[PDB]
Each structure stands twice: as C-alpha cells, then as structure tokens.
Design a protein around this ligand. Sequence first.
Ligand SMILES: O=c1ccc2ccc(O)cc2o1
Ligand SMILES: O=c1ccc2ccc(O)cc2o1
Lengths: 268, 269
Amino acid sequence: GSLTEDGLSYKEKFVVRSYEVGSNKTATVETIANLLQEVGCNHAQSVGFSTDGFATTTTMRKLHLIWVTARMHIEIYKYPAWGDVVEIETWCQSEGRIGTRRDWILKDSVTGEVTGRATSKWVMMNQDTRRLQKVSDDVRDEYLVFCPQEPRLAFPEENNRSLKKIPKLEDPAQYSMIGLKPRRADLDMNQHVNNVTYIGWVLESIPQEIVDTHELQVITLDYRRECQQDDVVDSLTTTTSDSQFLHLLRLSGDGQEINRGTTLWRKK
Amino acid sequence: GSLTEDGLSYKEKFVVRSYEVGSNKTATVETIANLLQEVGCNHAQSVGFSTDGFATTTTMRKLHLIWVTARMHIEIYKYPAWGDVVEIETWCQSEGRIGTRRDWILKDSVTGEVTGRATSKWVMMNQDTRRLQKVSDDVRDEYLVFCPQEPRLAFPEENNRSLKKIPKLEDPAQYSMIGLKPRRADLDMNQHVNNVTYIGWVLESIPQEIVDTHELQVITLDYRRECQQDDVVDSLTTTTSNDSQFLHLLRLSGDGQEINRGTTLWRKK
Ligand SMILES: O=c1ccc2ccc(O)cc2o1
Ligand SMILES: O=c1ccc2ccc(O)cc2o1
C-alpha cells in the first residue's frame, strides 16, 4: 500500500482469501468492511495519525478525544472472487464542525473497473465521558492538510441513498435473531466490539432464502451506542418492499437501541 | 505464494492486519489458524487438488470421499506484531492407511527465526454418510507424489505434546461459557462451521484474567463431530496445573453430545 502522488489519498491491493468468501465463492460484505478498515488504518499510519481505530492527532490525545463512526454506507456492484486482487483507494474529507468523512472506491485490479464504493461519517467524542462534540478550529485546522480541499465524493449524486434518514423499526418485527453475543475474535486491540461485527449481527435476521437467492447491493447502518463485551443483542428485520429491509439491533434485556439500518438486495 | 524448488512444500508471506490483532497488538491464535488454512488451500490449488477445505483427488470425488480434520496442534513462541510480515511453509505427509498429516512452520520474515509450528491429522470420510474409512491403496498411491517420501516433521521430539491422548472433562467444570452459536461469518463456502471457530469457542471459557496476564503457548484440539449451523454449544474449562494448563470440552447445549476436547498451555507474560 501507498499514498498517491499528491499525498491526499491511499491505495492498497488485497488478494481474497479462502476463509473470506461465502457460498457464491466471492468475498462477504463483512470481509469487504474489514478491508475498508484496514486500508483506512494504513492511510492514517502513513500520514502520522494514531493507529487504534480512533485516528487521533496530538491535540486530541491531550484532550482525551477520539473519532467514532456514526454511519457506514456500502454499495457493491460485484464481490471479488476467491484468489482475485481488489484495489481500494481511500481518502478523508473535513465536513466543517460536524465531523469528518472517509470515502473508499473498490476496483478489480485486472480490469480497472469500479466494483464498489463506500462512505462513512465520523464524529468527535470524549473517550471517558462518551460526550459528543463539535470539531474545534484548533483541532480541525491541524488535519486539513491531509484532506483534499475541494469536495471529492464517492457518492456525488444529489439526494443519494448514503444520506437518507432511517426510521425506527416498530414491534412486532417480521424476522428476528435473538441472544447474539460477541466472542474475543469480535473485539479489537482496545477490547471494543469491532464495527464490522454489527454488520454481521444486522444480517443474521435476514432469512436464509433471501441470502440463497439474492445478492446484497447496498447496506446503510447508523451507530447509536456501543455493544459492551458482556452485552447481548437482538437483531430485528422487516421487509419494506429488488428486496428492501429495515433493521434494528437492540440490547436483549431493556431494548436499548444500538444500531438501525437498511439493506437492498438484487435477485441473482 | 509459491511451491518450493523441489515442489514438495509451499511458502507464503502475510502482513498482519489491524483487525487481526488482540490486546497485545500481536496476531491472535485464531488469525494464525486462519493463515494456516489459507496457506494449506493455496498449496492444494498449486498441485491440482480441490479447493473447498476437503483437498480431494478425482477418485475421491467419484467415491464422494473428503478429508476432515481429526486434530490440530499449534505451538507459538512469538505472535507476529501488527504490520509484521510472517512467512509460513507447509507440506503434507501420507501416514499409510491411517490418513494424512499437514505440517507448518512459521518464521519472522525479517529475522528468519522460527516463531511457531503446527501439525494436523486428517482422516477420510464419506461426505454423505459421515462414515470414516481407512485410505485405500488406489487413492493413496495417487497423492504420494505430492509429499516428501522420507519423514519431515514439524514436531520430531520423542513423546512430544502433539500426539498425547486428551481425557474427557468431568462435571462440574471449573469455568464455562454457555449458549455459543455460529453466525454466517463463522461458516465456510460450503456452509459448514469453519474449523477455527471451534478454537475461538474453546478459548471463550478461559477467564479474562488469564488472557490479560498470560500468553497462549500450545493448544491441542481433537474434533469429534461437527457443530451444525443451527446447533448451540457450551464451552467448559478446568485448570489441570509460571505455567498454567487447562483441559477443555465443547458439547452441544441440549443433550451434552461432545463435539471437541482439548488442552491449552499458557506462560506468564
Ligand atoms: O488518513 C487520514 C487522512 C485524513 C485525516 C483527517 C483527520 C484525522 O483525524 C485523521 C486523518 O487520517
Ligand atoms: O497440497 C497438497 C499436498 C499433498 C496432498 C496429498 C493428498 C491430498 O488429498 C491433498 C494434498 O494436497
């Protein structure tokens, strides 16, 4: 992997592994999501930021501030087959005082064709109190030199899927998968549940017949609260329609929302 | 990755990823186990075998026979750090009519030093009836040309740990993690639970304080029966012991049917 010529984006190639593919012998969306995090981490390292999933600058560490994902949006046109090489390009944009955005483009290394695209919204938080914050001028002015100054969007189209508001699933859910809990492999180096685990949990309540006859095309996921290591989650899904679904992850006991999202599936 | 000069073994380098490491910022044993399966798959593909976790010959496919793991034994001296490159060499050996063995050696790419080793026992089974069988002469004679003829062992030592008999944990277990179930990410391309998931489930019943103060050095795991996609597993652990040793048992949550048994050895950090 390497920073591009202008130093404002990063590229890395990955050979899809035998254990990374599903029943169609192509990479799962969780494998894709893990590769997006890996290339994001390598980009942060290359330009001098923290490497731990929080991409902090010097002033942020002094203030005990971290970056946390508010939303992940992924659209896949073709999942790479086992043994294939996929090239991923990533960059960050400053969105004023709201926060930052990290975008990605996926291409087939042999054809050069765009096979997928992703975008994510990140907000600043105190790591101890968990209190959200607007980005200050002194903090923002420090990282602006690592971003393209003009807008560069993986999802440019006006009123596109990536920015749509997601409603809250109403009980009773059409489908459910209850009592999901993280194991040590679901945790990151800081003992926090990996963001990709929540995508897997959302997908658990999709019926196996949809998975067997359809390909996932778009997933949009909002992150409201963390699942702790000793928490238990219920995954709820209701058809809203191509097949479209509305999703809700909540804590198994009190029903506290942790995530909400939508998926769009194309018949094979 | 590539076959070595003599065509009897295969080597591949891997750069450790950010999501592959634990609290020590080094690769977890499940990341290591996944890399061992990946290099085994690439070796099978390079010499013309099936690529699906069953490494079948044309004759085996005709007879609906597959290879299935009976035991996995891994010993790690140093876990590779995040960003480090690890080189893994793998080869297979025919063990007469009993079955086959796949061995691996792990090295730090920069120093060339052996950082770990692993060995696994594989038995032949009918895919449909799940009935085990000895290896036939016509099947064995077909794959012997892909193995070194003289013994080449990752664990040569006399009565070494890799071949030791594992006893059955007696109730009550000292520690337990109940109601473990696989999700789609735990499944392979054939919708079977990945062998590495069982290592993760075994480790779930080790107390967090042991994980925080010790490094896993050796794990030996026997595979008795598959966990199906809709099965639920209980993970049991009892201390048997500077070094801590444990006895492990995975069984189906309802009837208590054994799926795996194993042992782990941990050294204080
Ligand atoms: O790799 C990057 C690029 C831009 C960027 C901007 C802010 C930040 O905190 C981390 C960042 O990492
Ligand atoms: O890669 C290999 C090497 C030897 C070998 C021997 C038997 C077999 O079924 C698969 C095999 O794959």
